Amino acid sequence: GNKLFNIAQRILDTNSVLLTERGDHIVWINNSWKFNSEEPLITKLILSIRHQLPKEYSSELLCPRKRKTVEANIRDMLVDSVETDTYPDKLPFKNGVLDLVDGMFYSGDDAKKYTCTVSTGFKFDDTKFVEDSPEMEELMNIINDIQPLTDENKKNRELYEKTLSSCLCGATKGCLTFFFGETATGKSTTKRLLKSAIGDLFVETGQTILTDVLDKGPNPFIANMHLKRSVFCSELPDFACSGSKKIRSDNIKKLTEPCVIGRPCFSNKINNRNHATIIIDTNYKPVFDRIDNALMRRIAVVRFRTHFSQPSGREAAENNDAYDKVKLLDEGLDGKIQNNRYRFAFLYLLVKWYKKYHIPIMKLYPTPE
Amino acid sequence: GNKLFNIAQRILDTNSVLLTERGDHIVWINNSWKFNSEEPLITKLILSIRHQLPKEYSSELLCPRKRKTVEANIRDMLVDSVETDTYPDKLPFKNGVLDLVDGMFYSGDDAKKYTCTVSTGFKFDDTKFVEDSPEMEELMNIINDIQPLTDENKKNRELYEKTLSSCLCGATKGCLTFFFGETATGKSTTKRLLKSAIGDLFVETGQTILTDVLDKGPNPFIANMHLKRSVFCSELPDFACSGSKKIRSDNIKKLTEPCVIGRPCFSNKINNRNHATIIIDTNYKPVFDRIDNALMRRIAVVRFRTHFSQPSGREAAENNDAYDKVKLLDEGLDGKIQNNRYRFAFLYLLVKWYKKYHIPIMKLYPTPEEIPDFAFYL
Amino acid sequence: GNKLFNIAQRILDTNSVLLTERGDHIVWINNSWKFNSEEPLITKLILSIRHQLPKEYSSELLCPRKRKTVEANIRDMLVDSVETDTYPDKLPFKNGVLDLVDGMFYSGDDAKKYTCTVSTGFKFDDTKFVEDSPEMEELMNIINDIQPLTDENKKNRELYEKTLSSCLCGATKGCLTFFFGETATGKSTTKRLLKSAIGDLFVETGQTILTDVLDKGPNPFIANMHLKRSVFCSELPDFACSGSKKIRSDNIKKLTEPCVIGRPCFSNKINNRNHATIIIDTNYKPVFDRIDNALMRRIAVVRFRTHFSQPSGREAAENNDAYDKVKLLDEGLDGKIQNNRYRFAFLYLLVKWYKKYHIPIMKLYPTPEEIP
Amino acid sequence: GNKLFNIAQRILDTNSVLLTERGDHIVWINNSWKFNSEEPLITKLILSIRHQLPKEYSSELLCPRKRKTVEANIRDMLVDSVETDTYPDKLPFKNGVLDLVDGMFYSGDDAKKYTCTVSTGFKFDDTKFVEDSPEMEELMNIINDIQPLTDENKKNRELYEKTLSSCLCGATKGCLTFFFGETATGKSTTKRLLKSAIGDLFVETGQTILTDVLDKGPNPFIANMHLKRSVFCSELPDFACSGSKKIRSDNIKKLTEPCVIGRPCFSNKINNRNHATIIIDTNYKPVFDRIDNALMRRIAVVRFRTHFSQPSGREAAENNDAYDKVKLLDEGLDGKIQNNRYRFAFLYLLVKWYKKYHIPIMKLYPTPE
Amino acid sequence: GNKLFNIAQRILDTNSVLLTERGDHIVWINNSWKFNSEEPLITKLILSIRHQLPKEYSSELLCPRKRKTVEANIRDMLVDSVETDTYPDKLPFKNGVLDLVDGMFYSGDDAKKYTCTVSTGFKFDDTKFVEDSPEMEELMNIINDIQPLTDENKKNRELYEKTLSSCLCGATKGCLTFFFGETATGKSTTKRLLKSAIGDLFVETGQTILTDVLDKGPNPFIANMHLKRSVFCSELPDFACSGSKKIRSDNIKKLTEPCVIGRPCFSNKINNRNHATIIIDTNYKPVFDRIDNALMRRIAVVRFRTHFSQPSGREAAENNDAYDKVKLLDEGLDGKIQNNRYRFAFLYLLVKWYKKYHIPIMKLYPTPE
DNA sequence: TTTTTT
Numbered sequence A, D, E: 001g002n003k004l005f006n007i008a009q010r011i012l013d014t015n016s017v018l019l020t021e022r023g024d025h026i027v028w029i030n031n032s033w034k035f036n037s038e039e040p041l042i043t044k045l046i047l048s049i050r051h052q053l054p055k056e057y058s059s060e061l062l063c064p065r066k067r068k069t070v071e072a073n074i075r076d077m078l079v080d081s082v083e084t085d086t087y088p089d090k091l092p093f094k095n096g097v098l099d100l101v102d103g104m105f106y107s108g109d110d111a112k113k114y115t116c117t118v119s120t121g122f123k124f125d126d127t128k129f130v131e132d133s134p135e136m137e138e139l140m141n142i143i144n145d146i147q148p149l150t151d152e153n154k155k156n157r158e159l160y161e162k163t164l165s166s167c168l169c170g171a172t173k174g175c176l177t178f179f180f181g182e183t184a185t186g187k188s189t190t191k192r193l194l195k196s197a198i199g200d201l202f203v204e205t206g207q208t209i210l211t212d213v214l215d216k217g218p219n220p221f222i223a224n225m226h227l228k229r230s231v232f233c234s235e236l237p238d239f240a241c242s243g244s245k246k247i248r249s250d251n252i253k254k255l256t257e258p259c260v261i262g263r264p265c266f267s268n269k270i271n272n273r274n275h276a277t278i279i280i281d282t283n284y285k286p287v288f289d290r291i292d293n294a295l296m297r298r299i300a301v302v303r304f305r306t307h308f309s310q311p312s313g314r315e316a317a318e319n320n321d322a323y324d325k326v327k328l329l330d331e332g333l334d335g336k337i338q339n340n341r342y343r344f345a346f347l348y349l350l351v352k353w354y355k356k357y358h359i360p361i362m363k364l365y366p367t368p369e
Numbered sequence B: 001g002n003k004l005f006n007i008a009q010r011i012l013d014t015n016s017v018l019l020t021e022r023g024d025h026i027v028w029i030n031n032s033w034k035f036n037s038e039e040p041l042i043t044k045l046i047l048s049i050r051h052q053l054p055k056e057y058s059s060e061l062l063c064p065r066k067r068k069t070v071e072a073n074i075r076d077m078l079v080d081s082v083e084t085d086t087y088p089d090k091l092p093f094k095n096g097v098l099d100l101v102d103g104m105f106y107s108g109d110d111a112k113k114y115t116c117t118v119s120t121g122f123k124f125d126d127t128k129f130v131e132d133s134p135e136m137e138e139l140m141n142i143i144n145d146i147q148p149l150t151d152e153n154k155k156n157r158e159l160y161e162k163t164l165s166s167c168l169c170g171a172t173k174g175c176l177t178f179f180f181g182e183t184a185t186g187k188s189t190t191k192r193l194l195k196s197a198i199g200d201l202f203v204e205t206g207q208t209i210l211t212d213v214l215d216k217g218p219n220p221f222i223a224n225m226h227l228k229r230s231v232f233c234s235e236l237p238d239f240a241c242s243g244s245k246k247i248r249s250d251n252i253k254k255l256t257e258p259c260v261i262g263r264p265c266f267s268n269k270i271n272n273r274n275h276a277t278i279i280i281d282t283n284y285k286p287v288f289d290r291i292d293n294a295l296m297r298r299i300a301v302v303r304f305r306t307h308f309s310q311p312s313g314r315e316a317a318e319n320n321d322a323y324d325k326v327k328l329l330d331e332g333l334d335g336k337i338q339n340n341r342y343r344f345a346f347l348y349l350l351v352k353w354y355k356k357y358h359i360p361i362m363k364l365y366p367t368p369e370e371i372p373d374f375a376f377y378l
Numbered sequence C: 001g002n003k004l005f006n007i008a009q010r011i012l013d014t015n016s017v018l019l020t021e022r023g024d025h026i027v028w029i030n031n032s033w034k035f036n037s038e039e040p041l042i043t044k045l046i047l048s049i050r051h052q053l054p055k056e057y058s059s060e061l062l063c064p065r066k067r068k069t070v071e072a073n074i075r076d077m078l079v080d081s082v083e084t085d086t087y088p089d090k091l092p093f094k095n096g097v098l099d100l101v102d103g104m105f106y107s108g109d110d111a112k113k114y115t116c117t118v119s120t121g122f123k124f125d126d127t128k129f130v131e132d133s134p135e136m137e138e139l140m141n142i143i144n145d146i147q148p149l150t151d152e153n154k155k156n157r158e159l160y161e162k163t164l165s166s167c168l169c170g171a172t173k174g175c176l177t178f179f180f181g182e183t184a185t186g187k188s189t190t191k192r193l194l195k196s197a198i199g200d201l202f203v204e205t206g207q208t209i210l211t212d213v214l215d216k217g218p219n220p221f222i223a224n225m226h227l228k229r230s231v232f233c234s235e236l237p238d239f240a241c242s243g244s245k246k247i248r249s250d251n252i253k254k255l256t257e258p259c260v261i262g263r264p265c266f267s268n269k270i271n272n273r274n275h276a277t278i279i280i281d282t283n284y285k286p287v288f289d290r291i292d293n294a295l296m297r298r299i300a301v302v303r304f305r306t307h308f309s310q311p312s313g314r315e316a317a318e319n320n321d322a323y324d325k326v327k328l329l330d331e332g333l334d335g336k337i338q339n340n341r342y343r344f345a346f347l348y349l350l351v352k353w354y355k356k357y358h359i360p361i362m363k364l365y366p367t368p369e370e371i372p
Numbered sequence F: 001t002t003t004t005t006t
């Protein structure tokens, strides 16, 4: 009796358009959920779903001013909203969703039931997601000389693996692991490896979240921390110096809650979902404002005790007692890392550790020693 | 002489669109009053109410171009405004309201006369709002370990219940409450249980509205607690260390009046309604600017003395003077809260406490014998 | 011909649409002058007036496209502006205008030559406007408890009544009465009673109108007092502490002028009409930035000296010298007030006081002896 | 070849629509040049002018849709721009123009030749613009009470009259005047009398034109005094105390120039024409940022020394050296001025003073003593 | 097949519409190129050009709806941008372009070759462009009084004339002139003379271009000086006070480049072409945030010494050190200057000065003394 | 920063 309404009714049965909690629609195209507020794309999904429709229904969609009518009817039908990003054990890529429990990679409408609005930013590659390669053993050699597999450096290696694998889970973690070691120890190597691995779900911030107040006016580094899965806090100054700013313990207490309070510039929204694994890359032993039982409850430390030096100052660092092993610095290492070399090898290693430490239940524990 | 005008008149005779004092249009879709400031929701209602109309009238509302003519007529016929949210003892859900007087759940046109423009955000399940379940047994055990029923902890427990049961009444409360205890005592667990129970009527604000003036420029932290029924302020710092402000005594008194003054960004609205119970989750005793009788009578305190240490620091916690029980930490408890396992059990408990305490009149009372400075001035 | 033009010409002869000096179009719907700056509601009037047009004309006003044509014609017809709100002794309601000189209520065309643009927001009931009722005796008992009718408390009671009754006049007042008293003395109760009595003509603003400037950028806290007949600034803080600003005397001098300068957000209009009785509900004595003869000419004080206590702390109150009387707190009074139970009893009381203090000339006077 | 085009051509030949240099579209309707950017009013003129057209053309202008075609044609036809408000000694009303040199009143095409785009807002009544009347006799007593006609108050009275009468001239003045006196001296009464006399040619702004920067962002407190002939500022704070901002000495120099740089919200026009007499009433002597010969040549002061007091405080006022006379307060005068009682009487007085002080040349002089 | 397309093709052959590089659409009507993003210039030109077309085409251009289709086609056939305002020694008037190095005045199609997109705003009358005239005598007397021809004031008068005549050449300059002097020395008189001479090529801005960063959102104070040949920033404040700004030398660097950056409201044109001579009439010596040797290479100062006083204060000025003459003041001078009395006389003098210093090359040199 | 823009 009235087509352009049966077309809209049929489109609404595939659940390709959803209404979110923020009052704006999300569209499922190119095997991804994307937001409508930026570019109008409820249309151009009609042109895409045109082929899954009867012949006499698909001819009417080759015309503007008729797709706008269909879009109006579709918009007048979505009343109730839905919640997004509810599954913490799924890793969303740019062309599918990887299951962290089994390791299977879902594409198409299989990776649709999980309303994942975030992504790594790069596409997957199953041919590179394999154990043996002229690149996985390079990575294992790169890792094994940063945290040696000895029984002396056994629990430190365990904590290292646990933190690195926990940077995949999309859930609130209460812990503030420190990466403590002298210069040229490999901390930035791990940071760049992780950034190459998990991609866009990664953030490198400054000192201001550990020393300043969090809700005095707007806070730019709070809104971009929404739904991220790993946060690095390098560039730590010296705190043994005179009159230097100390690490605010209340800041530590505020950064482990499931919801962080703060707003960006020119915004009325004050709430954020905390999914991040905050890691502090320090060079000196951290000292805080005050020490109490509520602070020792949210801190862990990982020690880096291996130096990498050129033959120039090899023997000078040999007699140093801050290290446990000295090796030769490689110059092409950073260039190889920045070219996305060990991306999928590191991803495979992280998944292997994840389904070894957190597969019954995901949690982090403090080591106030 | 017009059929799209008769459609609009018939719709307007069902009282499904209303105009409010703030200037917005509210519609009744899916057993709830909904509105959207940026884009009106009248045409959604026109498409939804299509079935109640006769056949020749309903067949015309399948065209987007005619639902605009109908909407224009409806906008022109609505002249006078109405008052909103005038019933305190009614808890609105996404599919009806619950009467706190007797515990009956209404839907349809029985829920429409209470023009409640807020809701918890979820649907009400009848089969889970019961007192016979394993979930209720677990919840009662958890609550009885957080706040034991010993005779030396009888007043405190009662206050506890009252305060929590206050978060269901949409009226102005003239008292502020403190949740004061040491680490690992159960304050955050209570906060998360309450949030899971009452949904979108719960808000978490910033420390900034205890210590900063509330009128210089835009303050979205004040304007966001409009018609909310529970406001939590967490992580109060120590007032002795560096960079520490003090709790302004005038802000405490401002956050007890039925109307608070404060505006959001890019806005000219400077008045908000106060229906909230304000709880400050602290770890050290609060320190105020000045002390007088007007600050005496708006402050209450609840104590948390029960530790939850893992069986490694058990003896060290047994050595502390701030705890009375050192019960074992449950590791999976924080997982079966965010999954809304104890949602309706805690709802039933809150309704029971509300019936017990706030049925004649809802009113909170101060407890000034619990603060050091207040004791000195007492 | 153009029957759509004749309809506009016929509407323009009933004087139901007017153009104001600020650029607004005010229409006359349901015995009230209304306007909406963002959405001009002329088509509302076009639809609601069709019953007064002949049969052949009223049928053409059911189309939403023909109403726009009629509205465009009406817009082109109106050229000259008019001035509004020029009668200070009239009280506008949602369905008429009450004359404070003789207590007569006007409706229809009689209550239309007073081009009032503000209102209380509620209707006027003539059955609840009686002198004798149970609500009236309850209200009188409440008021005589807040301000007793003794002989030492005689000037205070007169000032109280004068201020509360002057909150009805739509003219300019030079004075800044302070409601001063200790805790639980009945200041907020009086404020809420006045709120319930006068409806939308009541506004409550922030304290920045007393301690900040009124012209650095937008200020909706001051631009919202346009044509309001009562303004409250409740619960001023203490000035003895360090870090507290003082009350600026220039802000006091600006707030007693017929026109106050200040603009809202995204607005180019900088002028407001001051019709307000400003009351500062305070618990400590005010501390000013500077004292001179020009400041003491605009300030009055009303004291509150009756405590309302729970039976527990009744004894400690009678030892305090800040109270002259102690009574029992009523737990169900604020809920009764919030339900507009005494809405018309208090209105009758205020009108009775108005035709006792302000009927020849409406003017407020300072009391410089009170402020230390 | 077109009916709605010939209509626009005839309306253009009438010379009722013009284009100013600023970019506005003034039109001549009801014996007045009017304009409104927020409310274009060419269609008002099209509808109002149909009577001066043949019958076959006037019946086509009853359609709101057909008036917009004529307006579009008219907008296309106007290529060149003209300059407005070039006569300083003409006072425009709602229904004509008054010549200040001879006292004549013009209407119709006699008042159209002076492109006066501003107005008082009210009509000129000749039955009230007379010299003998009870209103004139009351007004003379009021003014002689405020400023007595004695021999030590002669120069002050002359300066008072000069400043008040200069508010009718549409030229640029080179002085700022201070109304200095103590409390209850008659300054606000003078302001209200002048306001009721000159109507919409009067404006009141804030103190940010004196102690602030006039160029940052939108400033509608400086862009509202465009082509106005009187600007008032009132209630200056005490500057000898603390917490006060001194009067910026360069703001004084900018305000005496023929044009002032400032723009309102949502507009690009950054130049406003200065025709105004600026008067600053105050209770204390002004305190400036810096004193220089370039400042003292732009400042004049007139003093108010009559006190109006209630019968209870009269005794304590005769002992004050800030007053030279104590009259008795009239309670009903404030409401009598609000109702525009002494409007045409005060206008007659102002014109009489003007054609005594400003006929050869209009210039204002400073009093640096 | 399309009449409204053939009309647009015909109009595109007359070369009456051009597209510049920023995106401006300039049109040629009334013997002058014009552009205005607000006014509808193309639909004005379409209606004005309808006569130089066949009769069958012309009658269609009387409808405002068809004049929009023609302009829509014209905007689509304009794909290539042309460069404009390349002749620096031509002065554009309202009816033609005057050559400075030769003295001829082209008009009509003769002036269309030089795409001079700006204008003085007034027509050029040759009869008043004569060397000998009473107005020339008065003007020479005035300019000689303002700056005398003494032997010590010859290095200053040459720079005065250089910077005054450089306001006619439409090309980027490299200096910022300061007209420094005491009170009542003649700086504003020179400014008014130059304004009345060069008309619409003269713009006046605020001090925010000096003391504020000119890269924040819309900024019509910077966007207004596009292709203007003179800019004034009168009345800078004294910077040795209790809280003051500085001239922000980086702005001085940005104000000498030929592509100063700034955009107006509701527009996306950010690049403005710098053709202006920036002059600031201060009363005190300027002070900057920091001083380098690059600054003094682009700063020039000219002094004013003659004092124009009243007979009341003639004696006190003869003892002031910062003066050389105490010549008597003239009152009716400004009124004559504001009436464009010495417009063409000053124009002739400026041209005579121009063909004396800038004939080989227009360069402005600094004065660091 | 916000507000203005937009």
Ligand SMILES: Nc1ncnc2c1ncn2[C@@H]1O[C@H](COP(=O)(O)OP(=O)(O)OP(O)(O)=S)[C@@H](O)[C@H]1O
Residues within 6 Å of the ligand: A294, B141, B142, B143, B145, B146, B182, B183, B184, B185, B186, B187, B188, B189, B283, B308, B328, B329, B330, B331, B333, B334
């Ligand atoms: N009844 C209970 N039985 C067992 N474990 C519990 C019980 N109640 C709470 N817990 C757990 O014990 C821990 C107590 O931590 P919280 O109460 O959330 O922290 P807290 O009280 O806010 O102390 P802070 O935040 O450090 S001042 C959490 O891991 C809870 O999940």
Ligand SMILES: Nc1ncnc2c1ncn2[C@@H]1O[C@H](COP(=O)(O)OP(=O)(O)OP(O)(O)=S)[C@@H](O)[C@H]1O
Residues within 6 Å of the ligand: B294, C141, C142, C143, C145, C146, C181, C182, C183, C184, C185, C186, C187, C188, C189, C190, C283, C308, C327, C328, C329, C330, C331, C333, C334
């Ligand atoms: N006549 C009355 N009889 C009994 N109770 C009263 C009466 N008037 C007021 N009350 C109650 O007594 C209490 C007094 O509180 P308020 O009226 O707010 O006094 P207050 O001056 O506002 O005190 P604060 O602390 O400065 S806000 C309230 O609970 C009133 O409801």
Ligand SMILES: Nc1ncnc2c1ncn2[C@@H]1O[C@H](COP(=O)(O)OP(=O)(O)OP(O)(O)=S)[C@@H](O)[C@H]1O
Residues within 6 Å of the ligand: C294, D141, D142, D143, D145, D146, D181, D182, D183, D184, D185, D186, D187, D188, D189, D190, D282, D283, D308, D327, D328, D329, D330, D331, D333, D334
């Ligand atoms: N000629 C007059 N005869 C009688 N009363 C007068 C006269 N002129 C003014 N008044 C009244 O005297 C009172 C004081 O005059 P104002 O105009 O307020 O003086 P003022 O300069 O404004 O003093 P401020 O504002 O406190 S600094 C007002 O009530 C006037 O109505």
Ligand SMILES: Nc1ncnc2c1ncn2[C@@H]1O[C@H](COP(=O)(O)OP(=O)(O)OP(O)(O)=S)[C@@H](O)[C@H]1O
Residues within 6 Å of the ligand: D294, E141, E142, E143, E145, E146, E182, E183, E184, E185, E186, E187, E188, E189, E283, E308, E328, E329, E330, E331, E333, E334
């Ligand atoms: N050559 C002249 N002969 C006669 N009068 C003159 C001459 N030059 C200027 N004047 C007048 O003398 C007065 C001097 O004012 P200006 O020169 O404009 O002020 P100024 O030099 O800018 O000093 P400022 O602006 O106060 S710091 C004006 O009224 C001029 O019209």
Ligand SMILES: Nc1ncnc2c1ncn2[C@@H]1O[C@H](COP(=O)(O)OP(=O)(O)O)[C@@H](O)[C@H]1O
Residues within 6 Å of the ligand: A141, A142, A143, A145, A146, A181, A182, A183, A184, A185, A186, A187, A188, A189, A190, A308, A328, A329, A330, A331, A333, A334
């Ligand atoms: N496993 C490794 N084998 C060889 N060279 C390494 C290895 N890890 C790091 N390096 C080199 O040693 C340097 C370590 O510095 P970096 O990782 O930045 O330490 P830090 O972050 O503590 O300064 C890097 O430049 C890197 O090229």
Ligand SMILES: [Mg+2]
Residues within 6 Å of the ligand: A188, A234
């Ligand atoms: Mg590094």
Ligand SMILES: [Mg+2]
Residues within 6 Å of the ligand: B187, B188
């Ligand atoms: Mg906690």
Ligand SMILES: [Mg+2]
Residues within 6 Å of the ligand: C187, C188
């Ligand atoms: Mg109160």
Ligand SMILES: [Mg+2]
Residues within 6 Å of the ligand: D187, D188
């Ligand atoms: Mg005054």
Ligand SMILES: [Mg+2]
Residues within 6 Å of the ligand: E187, E188
């Ligand atoms: Mg000057």
